[PDB]
Design a protein around this nucleic acid. Sequence first.
RNA 1: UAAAGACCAG
Lengths: 391, 181, 65, 266, 114, 56, 30, 133, 49, 147
Amino acid sequence: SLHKMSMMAHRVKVIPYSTFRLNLSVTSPYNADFDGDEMNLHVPQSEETRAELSQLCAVPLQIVSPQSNKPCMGIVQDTLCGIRKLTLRDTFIELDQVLNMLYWVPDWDGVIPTPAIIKPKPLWSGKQILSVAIPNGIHLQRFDEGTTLLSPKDNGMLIIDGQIIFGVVEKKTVGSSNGGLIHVVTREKGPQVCAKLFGNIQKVVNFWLLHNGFSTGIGDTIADGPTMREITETIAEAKKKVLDVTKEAQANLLTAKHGMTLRESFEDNVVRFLNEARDKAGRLAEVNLKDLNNVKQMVMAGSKGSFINIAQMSACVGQQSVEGKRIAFGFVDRTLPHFSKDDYSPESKGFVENSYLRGLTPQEFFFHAMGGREGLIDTAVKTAETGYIQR
Amino acid sequence: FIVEDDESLGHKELKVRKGHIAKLMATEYQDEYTWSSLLNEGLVEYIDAEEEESILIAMQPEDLEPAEADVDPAKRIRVSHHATTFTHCEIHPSMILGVAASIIPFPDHNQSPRNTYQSAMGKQAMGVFLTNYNVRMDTMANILYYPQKPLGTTRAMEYLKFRELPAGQNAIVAIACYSGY
Amino acid sequence: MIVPVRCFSCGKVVGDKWESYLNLLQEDELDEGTALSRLGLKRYCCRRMILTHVDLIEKFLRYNP
Amino acid sequence: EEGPQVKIREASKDNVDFILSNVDLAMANSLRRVMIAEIPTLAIDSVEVETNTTVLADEFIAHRLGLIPLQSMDIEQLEYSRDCFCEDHCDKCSVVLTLQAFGESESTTNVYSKDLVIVSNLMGRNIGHPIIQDKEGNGVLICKLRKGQELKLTCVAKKGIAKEHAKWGPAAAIEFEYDPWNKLKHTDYWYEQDSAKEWPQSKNCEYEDPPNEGDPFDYKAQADTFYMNVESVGSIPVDQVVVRGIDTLQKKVASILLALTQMDQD
Amino acid sequence: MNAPDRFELFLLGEGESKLKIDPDTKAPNAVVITFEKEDHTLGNLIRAELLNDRKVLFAAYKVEHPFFARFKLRIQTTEGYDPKDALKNACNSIINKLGALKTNFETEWNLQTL
Amino acid sequence: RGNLMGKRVDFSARTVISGDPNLELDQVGVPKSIAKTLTYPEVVTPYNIDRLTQLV
Amino acid sequence: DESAPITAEDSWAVISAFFREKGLVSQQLD
Amino acid sequence: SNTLFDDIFQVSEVDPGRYNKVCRIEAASTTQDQCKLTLDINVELFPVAAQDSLTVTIASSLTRSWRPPQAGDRSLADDYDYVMYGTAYKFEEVSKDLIAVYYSFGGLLMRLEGNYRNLNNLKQENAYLLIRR
Amino acid sequence: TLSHLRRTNTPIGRDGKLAKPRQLHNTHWGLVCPAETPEGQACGLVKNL
Amino acid sequence: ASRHGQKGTIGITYRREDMPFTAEGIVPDLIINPHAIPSRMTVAHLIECLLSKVAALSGNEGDASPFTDITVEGISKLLREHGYQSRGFEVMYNGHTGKKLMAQIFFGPTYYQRLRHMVDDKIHARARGPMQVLTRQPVEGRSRDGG
RNA sequence: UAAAGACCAG
Ligand SMILES: [Mg+2]
Ligand SMILES: [Zn+2]
Ligand SMILES: [Zn+2]
């Protein structure tokens, strides 16, 4: 418990089954997952004690936090990844559903709103009904990349009088971001009204997703046949760039950059060459994945995953490291007894060329290991030291 | 595995040969040429860390022995065996692992640490720890009602008796979003 | 550890097929993949059901009182 | 004939591949559920154990006995112990089987679904007969015993449905598909290059008219025709798994009216 | 240990009622019917039919929370027309269509071999 | 530090948690088992005599 | 050709043989 | 109950940047030379190929609960084959005396330009867009 | 049980959450498992043959 | 938890009728969230499935050993040779409405383990219970009914 | 009841 927020007041709801059930958006603050975490509850015993709980530390009250003058709770996982799709221009909802989606919003004025499309088939749009959860008097504008009061890319965000006018709704809008829909609805309508907004947005977007469905599979870790060739070579030549500077330093034809050793200077290049390789190597894949690829679809929502991932899973893992330098020579002048002394090639100091879809070679595997085992340590230390600092 | 280039007929080459092999699988069906054999017939020896320092090793027996005369754009990407001083060959890489990891399917496809995790959990899984559970009087013990040998497996489980005393079940799994629960 | 009466996932009984299956195996010498199919086990849920069971009980019986 | 209609293609003792058409996905689905979860059935639901020298545990064995399918033809003329007036149970609401096995042989003696011996009066009606489809006529291997291992039970089957528990489901599995040529666009095939090439065509494509590229999207479209395949476990005749389903769902909608009346009084 | 008796999914408890009908005040001539011990099976069905009677302005339904075996149905109709009736109708239709279905399935069944 | 700056306390409960998309943001589903253990001392006021008597 | 090379799958044979003699608890015993 | 704008445009070009069921189109007026148009169109309910004779009409009428059909026999100002509903957000003044207003139909945008709906084209929500051919 | 019988220990010098040992060493290849070591506290100090 | 550091606890259970299904009747026993993938990049999970869906249909011990020549392309080909999508995905319908799920879903067998640590072995509440002797404070341990 | 220890959860 290192937050005022790691302890908040809640309303009791007695229910069956043996678990403490809690709303997702309140997840982060406590920093809990459901992989087995437990949580404790304390019941106030006096009339004024409860008053102190309800009036001062109620979850609604804790939404926008001083910790960094911004909300500390936003929309996540399902609801998030799902609210994006519901929004996309393409996404239209037809009457039978729209009617349910509307009923779910506990506040709804019970006023089926005029369809955005009346012509052949009466149709409603994501934004359109998602807007039924957003209350009146909420004004929001963003402008991301090529946004232009007619955002071609459906960028940014423009909400007027509590109606989404344009732009896809994702992390930047309904997350715990600054100008955030949440940061605004709170300051603008109350801690109590914003608490209700989470519920609503979720009950809608959630329900909707339940029916649209959503998944993920290896099929999403696969890169277009040639995009792979285009990667294999990119790794390759970048390997050349190294053998080059590698001989150019064995000949003694190099300039020791003021402050560095010829040696230090050598590696620093090597490394940065291999990295730059991986990055574009990956970025190749990144662009090659249609906006249908789920993994890419989650990175877009801002619900999970990011570049490096798509990269390491489809293109190339990248140089494994320890204490900074590439894998050292535990054995005399070498990294493993499967190598000849004095080898500084990428495959010897720890460059995992393959992607996770392809699979690491006994060497890639064992170096990737040494790399990993380093974080697990650091983790199990930066945790005990931080604690005392905290104290 | 020893390499000794000692091949009249050609280059360097693993002492052990396709004959020895078939001669062992011969001793298998009999359930007289064991392991201690491959050892005393100077075909395979023990190497501690100290010694290992002064030896060269090959990963695959084949892949790291013929000359050169394309490749599958689906398989991984191995380097090469442009080495001649090979003194030994690896009986098999997968043996770098231990009892825990040997049950991880495709560990060479996971993020390094994830395998460290699973390596920890399996020691908290349920199954059948000994077929005589019925006659033992230990405090606390868990037996899985219907153990199932796992579909995807490992050549090493074969020795950890994992198919015999499994510790899980092949569940039909859907990776989807649903009620949102 | 005895054959599962009925398949977890879908419901089809499978309690009987054990002996049959174990027979189309050592005698009629067919390969598992087919044997199952012969036994009417179409879809993989019921299919993995038999193909994976470890009949431990047989060892359990080899004990005594 | 009049409204919704069938076209039973294949058919047997354990299946009914048919083509229910001219209905509502909604209604097709409801039927689909009811078959899976609310059709009465007879199942062992109580097990007294006098002796068990088996290698398996009391509740282990009981679990299975309840899984063993029982003849539920005239189930609809057996009352629910809850409803019946007998302090506990009787022949008017329950079947009582017996089971006894002894390691007689000098070699692993088996125990089968068949070995259950009804002991209550069935007041003449198809109920409680361990359903056997097994070749040798044994059905479901309950368990095995060595030398002098014994086992003396007593089971009491009672009525019941799938909701209360799975052992009351006569369902087993239920195929269900519709619009095999994605026309209603109720999906969005995932793909790498060509959706059509990459996604297997269903045997149901034949029984229906292909796309025809040129043509514009048919928005007025609607879901008619559902290719369903209702299996069965035996507790009840495949055909019945369907009728009784149609019939129950029917009673359900019924009560809503009925109750919606007792309400009118005030 | 905190597991409610499975039979609670279908047996009304002490003094509960399948139906409970409360008038929606938000909008004119509309109602909310609470079905006790009933899930989608009967909810999405009654919701569908009602969507055909065109003297029905609005109609949806939901399962407030999954632990609980009940759901709500909201129905709204063109003035004068009482929704309670609309529900009755939409209900009857369901059965008729269902009776037909039964019939047709047996007729078609008899004409079989195997 | 162990008995005063912090201590074990009464009226507390702990157990595995799990998300639920059907609870308002500020609620917390509490297992009945636990609700039947943790109590609150309400004082008999005419405002609740009836209710309280019912609970008793 | 009882003296031909050795493929990959052939290594398993060696191993099958290793554990037959030594066994998983080798060291704790010896 | 009346109208606010009428004309016929010819689509200079249609476009779907990753939009399987929607296309933003742009056409020119067949009268005023200064009248341009930008519009997102559900090209599933109404396809539109490059350079067609489209009749873009605005106006607001023939909002309280939206009622399904009923109007099987009612006022059907739908004498077209595409009628959206939405709102106008900004009324940008493209220099000169060339005013341009933007309209959003629940995510489907539009931009008009010219200058002769001086006391015509509202600045309100009201706005059924209509099209034909 | 198997994994428990192939377990290794290594004492430290108190504090010593330094990581010079805990780290997966090169020489460890083939003799110890690169993945199976406990988390936190005695991470890396407990190896598995 | 599966065998990939992919652990989790149940959050509810559904019956066949409510569960999402394939037109073939098959339905899941477990439904894990797509999100538990990207970040942890535990690809082996995904593979084990495709390999097992095949191995189950073919009754051939699916080999998932460390370093070998099996590839996702190879398995994919074998799976197509059975009538199923070659990447796993299968179309499914929402048990509630019966309507199809706009998205296809990765779907197949996967070996899952039942770790110890079950709720009713942890759940604990106290309200005024036994006290220590020295400090006269609440005792320690769910076992001793402490606070 | 109270110690000291090992193992283990997030
Ligand atoms: Mg956690
Ligand atoms: Zn099955
Ligand atoms: Zn009775």
